[PDB]
């Protein structure tokens, strides 16, 4: 099978820049196709037959190449271009796809908007105490979160989940969930979520 090696794996670029992502084939290919995928939706046809833009694909996008090396170029990158780009061939059977280039956009640093939430009444009655903290719309993607209970850092039972880059504001978001049982949660009073790229902290007191 023609193996497609896509480079780079992550292309980090600021808006206004010209970028090029590359698709190398183990063997010669007659036509290369490109798809754009944003999270929560299927791949969208983006370039077909090496050069042609799919409908509703901006003119900033171009495609090129031949033989065993193809490229997709963006003349001036915009925030809405953040997504994964996959090349695909079907010159020989089977058809194959590259592993994708994820285009990440740069922008100004942004502090997270931090929100901490106490467990609902429903949950505590069912013996559960999930304490949730959102760190929304921050940049860059690398951020640390720490939990403190009654002033002590707590590490066990913290599960973090990151979004992909927002297409509109080029920011990331993340949820940090401290999973306690009601029994554990009711032993303490002060619950703190701290963000560090000097931190941003948010707290609640159970007794309030």
């Amino acid at each position: 099978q023609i193996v497609l090696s896509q480079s780079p794996a992550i292309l980090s670029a600021s808006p206004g820049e010209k970028v090029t992502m590359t698709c190398r084939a183990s063997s010669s290919v007659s036509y290369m196709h490109w798809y754009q995928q944003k999270p929560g939706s299927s791949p969208k046809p983006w370039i077909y037959a090496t050069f042609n833009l799919a409908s509703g694909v901006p003119a900033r996008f171009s495609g090129s190449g031949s033989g065993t090396s193809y490229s997709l170029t963006i003349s001036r990158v915009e925030a809405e271009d953040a997504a994964t780009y996959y090349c695909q061939q079907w010159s020989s059977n089977p058809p194959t796809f590259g592993a994708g280039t994820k285009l990440e956009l740069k922008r100004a640093d942004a502090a997270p908007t931090v929100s901490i939430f106490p467990p609902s009444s429903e949950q505590l009655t069912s013996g559960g105490a999930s304490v949730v903290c959102f760190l929304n719309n921050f940049y860059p993607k690398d951020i640390n979160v720490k939990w403190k209970i009654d002033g002590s850092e707590r590490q066990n039972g913290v599960l973090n989940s990151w979004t992909d880059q927002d297409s509109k504001d080029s920011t990331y978001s993340m949820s940090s969930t401290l999973t306690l049982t009601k029994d554990e949660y009711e032993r303490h009073n002060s619950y703190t979520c701290e963000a560090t790229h000097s931190p941003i902290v948010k707290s609640f007191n159970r007794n309030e």
Binding site: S30, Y31, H33, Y35, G40, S41, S42, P43, K44, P45, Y48, A49, T84, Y86, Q88, Q89, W90, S91, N93, P94, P95, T96, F97, A99, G100, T113, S115, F117, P118, P119, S120, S121, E122, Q123, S126, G128, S130, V132, F134, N136, L159, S161, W162, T163, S173, M174, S175, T177, T179, F204
Partner: protein
């Protein structure tokens, strides 16, 4: 507009069988080759089946050959994938696709996809808990199987300020959360409801956001 709507995805045991459907419209279905492509949880895309206009010729990669059978019904304009001898590596989002009579083997139209999960775990409906204290609100969607769930806020009229956190699997069950941000004059002065659908359990759970 060309439409491709997959259905029939869901939970199935290793060694078991599941049959996907794809309802096509907006083109003369019986003039086109049709395909299935899947995307693994590692986000890799792989072609899994090709079928003829008339369903007389079928082609498959070695990994599914003997296990999956592509068929089509040109009267009802449905495309099908009977999957058998399922393995956990078949866990994936499955897309039906349409090419072009222009050749060149592009995938010119894709469905939205249906998730197939190969697992011995049970279907479990979620527990939905409001996350209440611009003001940010959330709903915690806890202890469900399999994927997926969808959270809508006031019937979609608040979608622009929404974050959807990827589900994490823990003790055989998924947990995810959704956040929404609204003006402090919008809530609590108005009601904010999260609506959580889990098709696998045919459940829809609504929770009102109210101060703790």
């Amino acid at each position: 507009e060309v439409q491709l709507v997959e259905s029939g995805g869901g939970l199935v045991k290793p060694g078991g069988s599941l049959k996907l459907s794809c309802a096509a419209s907006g083109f003369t279905f019986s003039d086109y080759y049709m395909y299935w492509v899947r995307q693994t949880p590692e986000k890799r895309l792989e072609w899994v089946a090709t079928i003829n206009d008339g369903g007389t010729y079928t082609y498959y990669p070695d990994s599914v050959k003997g296990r999956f059978t592509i068929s089509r019904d040109n009267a009802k304009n449905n495309l099908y994938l009977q999957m058998s001898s399922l393995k956990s590596e078949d866990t994936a989002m499955y897309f039906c696709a349409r090419g072009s009579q222009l050749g060149r083997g592009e995938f010119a139209y894709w469905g939205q996809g249906t998730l197939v999960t190969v697992s011995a775990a049970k279907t479990t409906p979620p527990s939905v808990y409001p996350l209440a204290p611009s003001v940010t609100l959330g709903c915690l969607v806890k202890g469900y199987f399999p994927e997926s769930v969808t959270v809508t806020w006031n019937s979609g009229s608040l979608s622009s300020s929404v974050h959807t956190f990827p589900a994490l699997l823990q003790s055989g069950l998924y947990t995810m959360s959704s956040s929404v941000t609204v003006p402090s004059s919008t809530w609590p002065s108005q009601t904010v409801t999260c609506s959580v659908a889990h098709p696998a359990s045919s459940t829809t759970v609504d929770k009102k956001l109210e101060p703790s």
